[PDB]
Amino acid sequence: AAPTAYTPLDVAQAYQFPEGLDGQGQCIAIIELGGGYDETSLAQYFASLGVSAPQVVSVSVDGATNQPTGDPNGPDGEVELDIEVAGALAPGAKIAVYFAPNTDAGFLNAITTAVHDPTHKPSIVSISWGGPEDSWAPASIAAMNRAFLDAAALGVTVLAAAGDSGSTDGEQDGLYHVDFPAASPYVLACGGTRLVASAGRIERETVWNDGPDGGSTGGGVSRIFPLPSWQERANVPPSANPGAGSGRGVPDVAGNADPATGYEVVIDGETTVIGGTSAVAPLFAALVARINQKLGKPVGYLNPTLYQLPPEVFHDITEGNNDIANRARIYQAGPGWDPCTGLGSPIGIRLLQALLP
């Protein structure tokens, strides 16, 4: 195969994003635990995309500030990527990037800060950081979970990439682990795929899996969180780990993440190509920004509503697995919800259609 790339507008096109909407009146908050973002690269990208640059603002949490390392191959990548994909698709909204110490408490304080932020009042929050759910301090996970719940009951969407290491989520204990915050049931977990689409159609789209060296979408069965009531007709399989057990399946939806069909971005002055699920939360954060707009109200927590929406609102991914550890093929995709791509990739238009009164 040959590695390609899209700009953020092309992929939106692919997924039939509702046109004529930009996020105006809306405000997206993006969580960042390191690195920074340089204004030269941003303006260059927003012009290069023939889009009017959206307002970007930094918010210091527990000390942390906007601290770019100049290395396009380091944190900055993640910080600029998030703002570039998000800002290019919903240029109308207002970006509010929140930086915090990379600690269990900085991550938490950052979320609660944005979530209840009275000055920027974001309606959506995008997270592209995380970690095995079984590696976080239990008190941490419960704290954050509630932070999300508090978020829901506040009319605020919370999206988060599902990882970049497949079903094993980068752990060699020989078991399967899913990623947090993605496992939190109050989070719309974003998985990743390898999309092959053009202005008028998605030629193909499979689970994103480039082996051990290339990365693969995180996904599977939570071992911490029970099976949501709204996810009970999704046929989440039980864990593949010996002992089995029900669990909140991951992810909820998926979007392009395969670097080999990555995003074309501008990091620290360098024009390169980034991938991974980190691109998907902001990808869909912009989606929700336009939908909130047309509606004139925050769709807040979308998970319950999504799981019972009809088939034509989602493209179903059926080929592929996100197992980069063995030949067992766990987890494997198939018709309808699966532990690789969840409900599949959304079709914005049909999704806004589905949500209006």
How many angstroms separate the Cα of 100 from the Cα of each of 133, 142, 285, 310?
Answer: 20, 19, 20, 39
Determine the Cα–Cα distance for residues 290 and 25; give it in Å rounded to an integer: 10
Instruction: Give 26 or 277: the residue with its C-beta nearer to Ca ion.
Output: 277
Instruction: Give 35 or 344: the residue with its C-beta nearer to Ca ion.
Output: 344
Instruction: Give 150 or 316: the residue with its C-beta nearer to Ca ion.
Output: 316
Counting Cα atoms < 13 Å in the Cβ hemisphere of 328 gives 14
Instruction: Give 38 or 338: the residue with its C-beta nearer to Ca ion.
Output: 338
Least distance (Å) between residue 347 CB and Ca ion: 14
Instruction: Give 134 or 252: the residue with its C-beta nearer to Ca ion.
Output: 252
Instruction: Give 10 or 316: the residue with its C-beta nearer to Ca ion.
Output: 316
Cβ atoms of 75 and 102 within 8 Å: the answer is no
Least distance (Å) between residue 218 CB and Ca ion: 16
Would you tell me which residues interact with Ca ion (CB under 5 A)? 316-317, 338, 344
Return the ∠ at Cα 133 (arms to 127 and 138), rounded to 5°. Answer: 105
Cβ atoms of 191 and 253 within 8 Å: the answer is yes
Any residues with CB less than 8 A from the CB of 311 and at least 6 apart, and which?
Answer: none
How many angstroms separate the Cα of 58 from the Cα of each of 28, 113, 116, 240?
Answer: 12, 12, 16, 42
The residues annotated with a catalytic role in the active site are 78, 82, 278
Least distance (Å) between residue 344 CB and Ca ion: 5
Is beta strand 179-180 parallel, antiparallel or unpaired with respect to 124-127?
unpaired
Least distance (Å) between residue 333 CB and Ca ion: 6
Instruction: Give 126 or 341: the residue with its C-beta nearer to Ca ion.
Output: 341
Least distance (Å) between residue 317 CB and Ca ion: 5
Least distance (Å) between residue 244 CB and Ca ion: 22
Smallest CA-to-CA distance from 133 within 222, 38, 13 is with 222
- 104 CB-contact burial (10 Å; exposed 0-12 / middle 13-18 / buried 19+): middle
Q: With the CA atoms of 318, 322, 323 and 328 taken in that order, what torsion angle do they form, in degrees rounded to the nearest 10?
A: -20
Length of the chain counted residue by residue: 357
Least distance (Å) between residue 277 CB and Ca ion: 17
Determine the Cα–Cα distance for residues 88 and 68; give it in Å rounded to an integer: 21
Return the ∠ at Cα 11 (arms to 9 and 12), rounded to 5°. Answer: 65
**Element spanning 105, H or E:** helix 104-115
